[PDB]
Write a protein that binds this DNA or RNA. Structure first.
Ligand SMILES: Nc1ncnc2c1ncn2[C@H]1C[C@H](O)[C@@H](COP(=O)(O)OP(=O)(O)OP(=O)(O)O)O1
Ligand SMILES: [Mg+2]
Ligand SMILES: [Mg+2]
Lengths: 552, 392
DNA sequence: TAATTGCCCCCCTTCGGTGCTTTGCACCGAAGGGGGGC
């Protein structure tokens, strides 16, 4: 099998091996499993067992990417529950945008990757399984795994560590060769001539074979484009492997989920992909088979995404001697796109940000969140942060980050004048407005009858109390502020006893998940000067205690 | 020393955060050198534990230093000179390297596992575990205490006026001597440590709560003052408003000038006198934990309160970079956190739990780029805006 | 009810836990679905 040292694995303390019965299998699956198991037994990958082993775990088979070949899987869920914890060494997924341009490239795959790594001997008894006989009568043949099984939660980490150990000497001897390893997939890039590169590839294959890792010629790619990790790699550009969007007349919940996932995958290189209207169709749904009609907003978004996907796009390879630039654009409804490039119109990567964090937000906070997401992704892919081009004025960002109560920062960035600019839609006055009317607003609600009232008693004698149903105290305070905004002129001073409403409004939101806050925002945008003042509620401050009984 | 976890504890299982290319290269070089001399050893995935790692470039030092976030391990591990705060000059010395001489208990080594990431995930992360006492773990000083006392005994007896305290990896050595004499003593201590194998706590002023002074008060001004006094009522029992509240009677314009009555002026003077005196009845309980709240006041100004119970502050201060360009808010907050932690270690010997006025994602993205210390205080993030700036 | 597997990254939605003062509301992490990888 391999001279690789096994990784010592143990069960969780006090646990025993699984004893799960084999479920019935179809004749095609049984024949495929019989053939695979016979070949594995001949090579010593599995061993026949008898009555001395009391464990069992169901087996089954699926089709591989290359059809006419079967992958044998074991439903090790019980054993996985009773297996010790592992720490995963795979910390992420390599991206072609992080690849540097190489003169010669080769993609290798090892055949029967897991089955070439031996399994810990003391653990082998727990991997017992039974191949059922064709039809019935004669009992199935019982085996145990001598190698890493597919379906066991310890197999991926063990294989990845073993492959790293195997590749360490070759990488030490050849520091000028770039080797990306993802499980058993090896991208090998070099600046050597094609003949020298192929000699190095043969040396690497011999090195792997010395460890029992065969590299069949079927999975050995020698000419571009290279199919690597879902991408097609050309000498000077990379694309995603073709994305086929489903074409359905009636859409179910599962179909919408699949479409949204495929669009999210496509958004890494196709600019302008939007999924917000399609994702909104998944809110409140219960059954995955329930048919969701499109809402004429998801239809427009789907048409736009299809139009975007019509034209083939490509990314370029990283040039470490140049600068990373990330351009951000707003799209509306909390959606943003971004392009990471080093030369103009030559995108390394593309992406979107549409997370709705928080009940109330503005454009500046969302832009900061998008910048943070781009920064962390760029640190992952290229190990450095890019220079940003944001549709926000330097003055606007200065005002926001100097007046905001939280610490906020954006790395080295430059303003770009793209028409949908980012701005704060209203500003709260730092001092009270002379000559303007002053409202003392108040709102109360009993937490038993779910009813309350709200008013805006004015210094000039004006007053109005409105009753409110099914509302809480916070809703009554927000409604009182809304009342003050409604019946005031272009300039108004407002005094309230609600630090919740103050906390909401002082953040300067422009969108909210509450319609009351949205109406308040509309009124605030309509006004010219607004000053908001807080006051301790039951402390005799006149106005907010002069007539809060009006609403209490 | 056979260390053990706290009863019923499992072990750290914290994921590694992504690192920049320079940090990863520095970590790879440092860990290769460490593995060459046996300080760390490569491990596999059958070890289920993990702590995050990164690298820092210390103050005006061109050498990268590896830093391990052992906060979970420190919380899970089962393992102070009152005159140091009154000293004149305190110098902090890094004595972490010494910890690399004493081996670590075998059964505990698995808890010190960490993973070096890769740029663009080119390879699976490389796992290591410590064979010797690691820097940043709270058990390392508790194990090296005997050797530290043995090394420092020839110095403390020769210099009885110098107060030396040890926290994690840092020796805070303080003296009441001249700054040149202090530097000479520091050089002596260095030489002594090598052969045996710039704070100023006197200027740590508190930040009191000051009421505003004005020759003419408006309804808005009196309202803000009454709110401030109502908030201070939880901190200074016996503070009063009454007459100031009586001034705010009826509905009046916020810009209306309202004269101060005799009772109101007298009570305002009394309130100012009460605020001037420090709060009485606060004592540092070593059993409870320290909580440090930070508020951003603008113009490069920050305020903070270290307390063990709410509304009973043990220290109030104001960190200030005074702008000086420095548009980086995260750098300012990181420097404030480091200074507050150093003050808390000097005064009480315990790092405080920080309530950072920042979004979590921004902090985890950018804090490592400005960190200069070898310790990491535990912190949580507050998502509630302060009502009115009452420490300004 | 079927088909039954494992690890990794991502997005989007839902739900329970936590905190703070305002037992309602905001925020966050885990888990469900999906995409991609092997
Ligand atoms: N669907 C899956 N379920 C479980 N493990 C999987 C799955 N796909 C891949 N793996 C694991 C086990 C494989 O040995 C390893 C490498 O993947 P892969 O190249 O597809 O197969 P393989 O090495 O077994 O066979 P071969 O290359 O000969 O077709 O990744
Ligand atoms: Mg393979
Ligand atoms: Mg493969």
């Amino acid at each position: 099998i391999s001279p690789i040292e096994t990784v010592p694995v143990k069960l969780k303390p006090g646990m025993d091996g699984p004893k799960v019965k084999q479920w019935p299998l179809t004749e095609e699956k049984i024949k495929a499993l019989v053939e695979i198991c016979t070949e594995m037994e001949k090579e010593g990958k599995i061993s026949k067992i008898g009555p001395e082993n009391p464990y069992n775990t169901p087996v089954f088979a699926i089709k591989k990417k290359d059809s006419t070949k079967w992958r044998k899987l074991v439903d090790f869920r019980e054993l996985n529950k009773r297996t010790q914890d592992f720490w995963e060494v795979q910390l992420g997924i390599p991206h072609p945008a992080g690849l540097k341009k190489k003169k010669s490239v080769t993609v290798l795959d090892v055949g029967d990757a897991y089955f070439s790594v031996p399994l810990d001997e003391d653990f082998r008894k727990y991997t017992a399984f039974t191949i059922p006989s064709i039809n019935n009568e004669t009992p199935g043949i019982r085996y145990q795994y001598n190698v890493l099984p597919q379906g066991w939660k310890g197999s991926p980490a063990i294989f990845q560590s073993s492959m790293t150990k195997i590749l360490e000497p070759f990488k030490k001897q050849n520091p000028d060769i770039v080797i990306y390893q993802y499980m058993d997939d090896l991208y090998v890039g070099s600046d050597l001539e094609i003949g020298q590169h192929r000699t190095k590839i043969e040396e690497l294959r011999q090195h792997l074979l010395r460890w029992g890792l065969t590299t069949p010629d079927k999975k050995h790619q020698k000419e571009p484009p290279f199919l690597w990790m879902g991408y097609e790699l050309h000498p000077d550009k990379w694309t995603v492997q073709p994305i086929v969007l489903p074409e359905k007349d009636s859409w179910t919940v599962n179909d919408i989920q699949k479409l949204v996932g495929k669009l999210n995958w496509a958004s890494q290189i196709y600019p302008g992909i939007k999924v917000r209207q399609l994702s909104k169709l998944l809110r409140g749904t219960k059954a995955l088979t329930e048919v969701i009609p499109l809402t004429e907003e998801a239809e427009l978004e789907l048409a736009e995404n299809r139009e975007i996907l019509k034209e083939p796009v490509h990314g370029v390879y990283y040039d470490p001697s140049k600068d990373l630039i990330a351009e951000i654009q707003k799209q509306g409804q909390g959606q943003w796109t971004y392009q990471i490039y080093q030369e103009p119109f030559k995108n390394l990567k593309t992406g979107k940000y549409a997370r709705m964090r928080g009940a109330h937000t503005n454009d500046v906070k969302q832009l900061t969140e998008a910048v943070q997401k781009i920064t962390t992704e760029s640190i992952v892919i290229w190990g450095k942060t890019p220079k940003f081009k944001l549709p926000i004025q330097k003055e606007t960002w200065e005002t926001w980050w100097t007046e905001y109560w939280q610490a906020t920062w954006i790395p080295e960035w430059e303003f770009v004048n793209t028409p949908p600019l980012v701005k704060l839609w209203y500003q709260l006055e730092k001092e009270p407005i002379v000559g303007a009317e002053t409202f003392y607003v108040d709102g109360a609600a009993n937490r038993e009858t779910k009813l309350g009232k709200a008013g805006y008693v004015t210094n000039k004698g004006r007053q109005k109390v409105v009753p409110l149903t099914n509302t809480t105290n916070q809703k009554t305070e927000l409604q009182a502020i809304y009342l003050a905004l409604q019946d005031s002129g272009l300039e108004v001073n407002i005094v309230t006893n609600s630090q919740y409403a103050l906390g909401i409004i002082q953040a300067q939101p422009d969108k909210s998940e509450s319609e009351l806050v949205n109406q308040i925002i509309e009124q605030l945008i309509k006004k010219e000067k607004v000053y908001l003042a807080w006051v301790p509620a039951h402390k005799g401050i006149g106005g907010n205690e002069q007539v809060d009984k009006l609403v209490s | 020393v056979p260390v053990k976890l706290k009863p019923g504890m499992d072990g750290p299982k914290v994921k590694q955060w992504p690192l920049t290319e320079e940090k990863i290269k520095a970590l790879v070089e440092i860990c290769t050198e460490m593995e060459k001399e046996g300080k760390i050893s490569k491990i596999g995935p059958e070890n289920p534990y993990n702590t995050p790692v990164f690298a820092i470039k210390k103050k005006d030092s061109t050498k990268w230093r590896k830093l391990v976030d052992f906060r979970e391990l420190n919380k899970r591990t089962q393992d102070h000179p009152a005159g140091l705060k009154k000293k004149k000059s305190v110098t902090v010395l890094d004595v972490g390297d010494a910890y690399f001489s004493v081996p670590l208990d075998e059964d505990f080594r698995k808890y010190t596992a960490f993973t070096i990431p890769s740029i663009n995930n080119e390879t699976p992360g490389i796992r290591y575990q410590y064979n010797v006492l690691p820097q940043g773990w709270k058990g390392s000083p508790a194990i090296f205490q005997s050797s530290m006392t043995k090394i420092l005994e020839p110095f403390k007896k020769q210099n009885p006026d110098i107060v030396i305290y040890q926290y994690m990896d840092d020796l805070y050595v303080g003296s009441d001597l001249e700054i040149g004499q202090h530097r000479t003593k520091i050089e002596e201590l260095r030489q002594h440590l090598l052969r045996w194998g710039e704070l100023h706590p006197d200027k740590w002023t508190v930040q009191p709560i000051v009421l505003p002074e004005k020759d003419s008060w408006t309804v808005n001004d009196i309202q803000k003052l009454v709110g401030k006094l109502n908030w201070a009522s939880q901190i200074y029992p016996g503070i009063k408003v009454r007459q100031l509240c009586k001034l705010l009677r009826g509905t009046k314009a916020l810009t209306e000038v309202i004269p101060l009555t005799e009772e109101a002026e007298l009570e305002l003077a009394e309130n100012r006198e009460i605020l001037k005196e420090p709060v009485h009845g606060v004592y540092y309980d070593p059993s409870k934990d320290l909580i440090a709240e930070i508020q951003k006041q603008g113009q490069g100004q920050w305020t903070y309160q270290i307390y063990q119970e709410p509304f009973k502050n043990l220290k109030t201060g104001k960190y200030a970079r005074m702008r000086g360009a420095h548009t980086n808010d995260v750098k300012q907050l990181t420097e404030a956190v480091q200074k507050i932690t150093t003050e808390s270690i000097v005064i009480w010997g315990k790092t405080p739990k920080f309530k950072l006025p920042i979004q979590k994602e921004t902090w985890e993205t950018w804090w490592t780029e400005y960190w200069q210390a070898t310790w990491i205080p535990e912190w949580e993030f507050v998502n509630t805006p302060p009502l009115v700036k009452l420490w300004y």
